[PDB]
């Protein structure tokens, strides 16, 4: 299943990845960011509906200098003490947020259109693939509409969220280790269930992959 | 005229459409009074609008809570994370500054992103403020989260004419807690939904549709 999913990712397709019944119990739509299109963004906002985020391998975040948003807030809590009252001290370690900064490519206007978000994401993967790390600040601004996620060091070895799982899968496909993901939301107000997302994959002929499968394959 | 109608709509917990200006974003946001938000509103916003789902707060509220603009948090944090410095939004195309603030989740939510969780977070925020329980902010919410907050400018539309100020302006005029939840309406072509298509939506679902100038003048 993993290998089949790698083939789909290499073709610029969206695949579906479920984490686990024990964790978020959620399914994310996933694309290799280097192949993102305005169409992917439209399908994600319409059919998934969660936040559209772009996950980056730890090595990339270290080269760009991108930290966890929690670390940015903790440092800033010195001046803005409310950020201290909002500390996420009640979240299980395994679920600690992968949230990083938000950005827009400077060439975008409002930054929120499908065209703008696909451009912002595609230009970021372009910059990273080409190794023009220093051009990051020249080309992008923060805050913005595209949320970046920082994957854990050692990926699925230390954290098993969609952030790690999907980046691990892009690494395994020999692609730039950056993915764009969006949680699938249901009409009952909760996350779409595993059976409901498996059903969506069958209808739209997309690959449905199990998180444990990626984890086992990678490890 | 239509402003009064829009006010009556907001008081009834309904959604209204607010277009800013051709000379600004040229976008239309679906808007609801946060004290009246429901999971169904979140679902209509993500499926039929599609942009980010943000919650705008009157500056007075922000001051009582100590909530700063995100750019200020990043500016201060740039002392530790240099990349932030190089990500400054010094070239924002449509206005002098962003209304972006911190993101939050109520501590009682699970993943924070579901319709049920996002409505719970926003409504509880509106209730806490309505009850003047500001000292409970940190006790009930954490950051980062899936709900993005926006800080309206001091003096509302007197100093900034964004959807952030305009909607907070309307809520105030309606004698409601000055906190709104807004989502940009996106088009199938990849650009923001056109003034025309947003009009067709409003007429089809009988929602009050307003323009920026009308709200500003009325305020
Ligand atoms: O929080 C999220 C988006 O912002 C989603 O859960 C997304 O799948 C990435 O998070 P995680 O790695 O914890 O699964
Ligand atoms: O940035 C945004 C995300 O919520 C939208 O533009 C929203 O309408 C608020 O921004 P503004 O006050 O500039 O119109
Ligand atoms: Ca998560
Ligand atoms: Ca804006
Ligand atoms: Ca201005
Ligand atoms: Ca009608
Ligand atoms: Zn997840
Ligand atoms: Zn706007
Ligand atoms: Zn209708």
UniProtKB/Swiss-Prot annotation, chain B:
* Record's cofactor remark: Requires divalent metal ions, preferentially magnesium, for activity. Binds 2 divalent metal cations per subunit. Zinc and calcium, which are present in the crystals do not support the enzymatic reaction.
Known outcome of mutating residue 29 to S: Reduces activity 30-fold
Q: Which reaction does it catalyse?
A: D-ribulose 5-phosphate = (2S)-2-hydroxy-3-oxobutyl phosphate + formate + H(+)
Q: Which residues bind Mg(2+) 1?
A: 25
Keyword match Membrane: no
What GO molecular-function term can you cite, just one?
A: manganese ion binding
Top-level class of the enzyme under EC nomenclature: lyase
Any one cellular component term from GO for this entry?
Answer: cytosol
- The UniProt annotation places D-ribulose 5-phosphate binding at 24-25, 29, 160-164
One short Pfam name that applies is: DHBP_synthase
Q: Which UniProt keywords apply?
A: Lyase, Magnesium, Manganese, Metal-binding, Riboflavin biosynthesis
The outcome of changing residue 20 to E/N is: Loss of activity
InterPro entries recorded for this chain?
A: DHBP_synth_RibB-like_a/b_dom, DHBP_synthase_RibB
Q: What is the effect of changing residue 160 to S?
A: Reduces activity 10-fold. Increases Km for ribulose-5-phosphate 7-fold
Q: Which cofactor does it need?
A: Mg(2+); Mn(2+)
- Name the reported effect of residue 165 to S: Increases Km for ribulose-5-phosphate 8-fold
> What happens when you mutate residue 54 to G?
Reduces activity 70-fold. Increases Km for ribulose-5-phosphate 7-fold
Q: What is the effect of changing residue 27 to Q?
A: Reduces activity 23-fold
Physiological role: Catalyzes the conversion of D-ribulose 5-phosphate to formate and 3,4-dihydroxy-2-butanone 4-phosphate.
Q: How does it assemble?
A: Homodimer.
Q: Under which name does UniProt file this protein? A: 3,4-dihydroxy-2-butanone 4-phosphate synthase
Q: Which organism is it from?
A: Methanocaldococcus jannaschii (strain ATCC 43067 / DSM 2661 / JAL-1 / JCM 10045 / NBRC 100440)
């Amino acid at each position: 299943n993993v290998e089949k999913a790698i083939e789909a990712l290499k073709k610029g397709e969206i695949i579906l990845v479920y984490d686990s019944d024990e964790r978020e119990g959620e399914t994310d739509m996933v694309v290799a960011s280097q192949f993102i299109t305005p169409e992917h963004i439209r399908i994600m906002r319409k059919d998934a509906g969660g936040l559209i985020c772009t996950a980056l391998h730890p090595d990339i975040c270290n080269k760009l200098g991108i930290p966890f948003m929690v670390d940015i807030l903790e440092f800033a809590s010195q001046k803005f003490k409310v950020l201290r009252e909002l500390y996420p001290n009640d979240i299980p370690y395994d679920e600690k947020s992968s949230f990083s900064i938000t950005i827009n490519h400077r060439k975008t206007f409002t930054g929120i259109t499908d065209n703008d978000r696909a451009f912002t994401i595609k230009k970021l993967a372009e910059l990273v693939k080409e190794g023009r790390f220093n051009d990051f600040g020249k080309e992008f601004r923060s805050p913005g509409s595209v949320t970046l996620l920082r994957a854990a060091e050692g990926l699925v070895k230390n954290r098993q969220g969609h952030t790690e799982m999907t980046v691990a899968l892009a690494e395994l496909a020999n692609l730039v280790p950056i993915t764009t993901i969006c949680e699938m939301m249901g009409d009952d107000g909760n996350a779409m269930s595993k059976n409901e997302t498996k059903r969506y994959a069958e209808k739209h002929n997309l690959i449905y992959l199990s998180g444990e499968e990626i984890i086992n394959y990678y490890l």
